[PDB]
Design an enzyme around this catalytic site. Structure first.
Site, PDB file in Angstrom:
ATOM      1  N   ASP A 168       0.719  -1.193   0.032  1.00  0.00           N
ATOM      2  CA  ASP A 168      -0.054  -0.050   0.104  1.00  0.00           C
ATOM      3  C   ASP A 168       0.793   1.311  -0.005  1.00  0.00           C
ATOM      4  O   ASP A 168       1.538   1.498   1.037  1.00  0.00           O
ATOM      5  CB  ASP A 168      -1.018  -0.094   1.255  1.00  0.00           C
ATOM      6  CG  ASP A 168      -1.726   1.388   1.335  1.00  0.00           C
ATOM      7  OD1 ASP A 168      -2.120   2.132   0.296  1.00  0.00           O
ATOM      8  OD2 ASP A 168      -2.237   1.697   2.574  1.00  0.00           O
ATOM      9  N   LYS A 184       2.243  11.503  -3.688  1.00  0.00           N
ATOM     10  CA  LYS A 184       1.432  10.802  -4.356  1.00  0.00           C
ATOM     11  C   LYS A 184       0.490  11.841  -4.821  1.00  0.00           C
ATOM     12  O   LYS A 184      -0.160  11.506  -5.905  1.00  0.00           O
ATOM     13  CB  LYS A 184       0.818   9.978  -3.470  1.00  0.00           C
ATOM     14  CG  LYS A 184      -0.264   9.002  -3.924  1.00  0.00           C
ATOM     15  CD  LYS A 184      -0.593   8.142  -3.083  1.00  0.00           C
ATOM     16  CE  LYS A 184      -1.836   7.100  -3.574  1.00  0.00           C
ATOM     17  NZ  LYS A 184      -2.496   6.498  -2.761  1.00  0.00           N
ATOM     18  N   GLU A 230      -7.107   0.538  -4.237  1.00  0.00           N
ATOM     19  CA  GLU A 230      -7.041   0.241  -2.869  1.00  0.00           C
ATOM     20  C   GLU A 230      -8.369  -0.189  -2.303  1.00  0.00           C
ATOM     21  O   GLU A 230      -8.372  -1.118  -1.655  1.00  0.00           O
ATOM     22  CB  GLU A 230      -6.575   1.685  -2.390  1.00  0.00           C
ATOM     23  CG  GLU A 230      -5.133   2.221  -2.534  1.00  0.00           C
ATOM     24  CD  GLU A 230      -4.997   3.666  -2.191  1.00  0.00           C
ATOM     25  OE1 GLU A 230      -3.906   4.132  -2.948  1.00  0.00           O
ATOM     26  OE2 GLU A 230      -5.704   4.092  -1.568  1.00  0.00           O
ATOM     27  N   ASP A 268     -12.932   5.008   3.584  1.00  0.00           N
ATOM     28  CA  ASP A 268     -11.457   5.168   3.700  1.00  0.00           C
ATOM     29  C   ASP A 268     -11.202   6.577   4.220  1.00  0.00           C
ATOM     30  O   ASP A 268     -10.902   7.277   3.467  1.00  0.00           O
ATOM     31  CB  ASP A 268     -10.700   4.840   2.556  1.00  0.00           C
ATOM     32  CG  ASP A 268      -9.169   4.697   2.617  1.00  0.00           C
ATOM     33  OD1 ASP A 268      -8.506   5.353   3.565  1.00  0.00           O
ATOM     34  OD2 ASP A 268      -8.504   3.758   1.937  1.00  0.00           O
TER      35      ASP A 268
END
Ligand SMILES: N#Cc1ccc(COC[C@H]2O[C@@H](n3c(NCc4ccc(Cl)c(Cl)c4)nc4c(N)ncnc43)[C@H](O)[C@@H]2O)cc1
Length: 539
Positions: free
Chosen positions: A7, A68, A172, A196
């Site tokens: 991850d 990211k 994800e 999430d």
């Protein structure tokens, strides 16, 4: 030997491995099962992970994080230009690409976002190798579901630079669903909502799992909402309290604010399991010790708007997926901030008391599922695709949705598109796209002798019938005369693999907006022409 699952998160990354029939989340050199996605450059060395974040206050202009948010994007993206204003490090443009610029060993150095991500992946690879005692090569890296092909290729290139063979890039939320085994459940297709809430990002994903196939129905959320904002609410509250009691504003002193923020974050984590937490800071500002407390109710009040607003992306994802809240079969909590009891209570009350899947560590479920998928790729009767016919404009009108139990029979009524249309061309297609150009033609037959009538007047009944063996019989009947025609289509021979179905479903995901915009282009929805649209002349 075995492949790892990684991850690669915005602020923290995680690595896991499937061995001895068990998924193990690998702790780092400092014993942490999650490693900060930080890269720091000093006068002598390049630090990655815990060591990089531990000195961020000393070297903030050369400590890179949140890379990211830049990967796969061009420099002139509005997201990049907006994010640049919040980072202590410099972002520059190089032939239409953003690069982070720092000072390293007394020299100015610039790196692409995939290079910083490759450094983070090198750290995770070394952690996995220290745990396993052998060189790790094959890996599965996860990305947000809303990533485009460019961002996924950039993440794969970041993996390649780090010496990793990226077996596959998976989403994800799909990894989180795999970690819970929602794809191994018995029955019809399941609707899954991945909630999430991490340190700085919030992602709601709605997927549909059918015969082990994952389809991302919708995505929503807030790219700048996380536990850091709750910490900041607490910090402002306690700054106000200090100014109100001791008549002093501590905002001028950076170290006092840092100590207060660390104490507030720890107290928040305590509040997830206790109804109150203590704040004890010796000599916080001008010698005055700060010893106070905060109840869980006060913490919830300080974050009431953010907590309750987490429900709006849920509603948006439900609307975009064309589903009622009662149609959700599974709810999966991911991200550390989902440990907050008020968030769980809000989400559960929204779904009228439905139980939440939270037994797996929300910080590790994505890496858990990635490791499961890496082990699968390393070695560990329903219909496969939607069936329909071509209607006017060459659009796909589905009669038998994908993952429908066979044997089955579905009938729909259609009509003519032009005036005095003498016949209709029934064209059977199989696929998940809106236009028949992007589907597979299985067969066609003509129904002629339609009595002259205005457009929309004639009625043509089309029936799809699938027996137990899968043999597909498609029939068309002129409802004014009883005249009929039909075709038999051999739906067998193992012509499709699971990978083929996954690829078609993911291509349907990729062009969802264009498919929608071109599906509603035609006014009528059950109009049949007499020709094949894909063989008609166009510029
Ligand atoms: N060690 C470690 C470690 C493990 C996971 C993470 C990722 O956490 C990201 C987000 O998750 C938040 N969070 C976390 N994070 C998990 C965590 C576990 C242990 C430690 Cl020492 C730390 Cl500090 C963080 N737990 C929370 C909780 N119990 N109640 C409310 N928020 C919690 C965290 O504060 C941040 O907002 C960060 C560090």
């Amino acid at each position: 030997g075995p492949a790892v699952g990684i991850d690669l998160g915005t602020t923290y990354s995680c690595v896991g491995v499937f061995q001895h029939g068990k998924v193990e989340i690998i702790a780092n050199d400092q014993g942490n099962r999650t490693t900060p996605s930080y890269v720091a450059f000093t006068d002598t060395e390049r630090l990655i992970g815990d060591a990089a974040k531990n000195q961020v206050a000393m070297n903030p202009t050369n400590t890179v994080f949140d890379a990211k948010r830049l990967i796969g994007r061009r420099f002139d993206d509005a997201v990049v230009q907006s994010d640049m204003k919040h980072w202590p490090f410099m972002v520059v443009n190089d032939a239409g690409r953003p690069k982070v610029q720092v000072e390293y060993k007394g020299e100015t150095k610039s790196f692409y976002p995939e290079e910083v991500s490759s450094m983070v992946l090198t750290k995770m690879k070394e952690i996995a190798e220290a745990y396993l005692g052998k060189t790790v090569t094959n890996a599965v890296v996860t990305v947000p579901a809303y990533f485009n092909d460019s961002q996924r290729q950039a993440t794969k290139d970041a993996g390649t630079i780090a010496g990793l063979n990226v077996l596959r890039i998976i989403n994800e939320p799909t990894a989180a669903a795999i970690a819970y085994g929602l794809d191994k459940k018995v029955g019809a297709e399941r609707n899954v909502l991945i909630f999430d809430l991490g340190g700085g990002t919030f992602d709601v994903s709605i997927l549909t799992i059918a015969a082990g196939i994952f389809e991302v129905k919708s995505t929503a959320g807030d790219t700048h909402l996380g536990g850091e904002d709750f910490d900041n609410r607490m910090v402002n509250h306690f700054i106000a309290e200090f100014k109100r009691k001791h008549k002093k504003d501590i905002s001028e002193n950076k170290r006092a604010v840092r100590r207060l923020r660390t104490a507030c974050e720890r107290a928040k984590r305590t509040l997830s399991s206790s109804t109150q937490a203590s704040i004890e800071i010796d000599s916080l500002y001008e010698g005055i010790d700060f010893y106070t407390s905060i109840t869980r109710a006060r913490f919830e009040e300080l974050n009431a708007d953010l907590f309750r607003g987490t429900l709006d992306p849920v509603e948006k994802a439900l609307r975009d997926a064309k589903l009622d809240k009662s149609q959700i079969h599974d709810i999966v909590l991911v991200g550390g901030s989902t440990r907050i009891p008020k968030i769980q209570k809000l989400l559960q009350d929204f779904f009228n008391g439905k139980e939440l899947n939270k037994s797996i560590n929300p910080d590790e479920a994505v890496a858990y599922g990635a490791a499961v998928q890496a082990a699968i790729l390393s070695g560990d009767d329903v219909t496969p695709l939607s069936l329909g016919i071509e209607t006017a404009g060459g659009v796909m009108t589905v009669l038998i949705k994908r993952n429908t139990t066979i044997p089955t029979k579905q009938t729909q009524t259609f009509t003519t598109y032009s005036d005095n249309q003498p016949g209709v061309l029934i064209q059977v297609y199989e696929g998940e796209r809106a236009m028949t150009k992007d589907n597979n033609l299985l067969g066609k037959f003509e129904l002629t002798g339609i009595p002259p009538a205005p457009r929309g007047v004639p009625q043509i009944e089309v029936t799809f019938d699938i027996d137990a063996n899968g043999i597909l019989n498609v029939s068309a009947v002129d409802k004014s005369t009883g005249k009929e025609n039909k075709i038999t289509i051999t739906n067998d021979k193992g012509r499709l693999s699971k990978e083929d179905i996954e690829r078609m479903v993911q291509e349907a995901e990729k062009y969802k907006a264009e498919d929608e915009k071109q599906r509603d282009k035609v006014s009528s929805k059950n109009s049949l022409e007499s020709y094949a649209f894909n063989m008609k002349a166009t510029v």
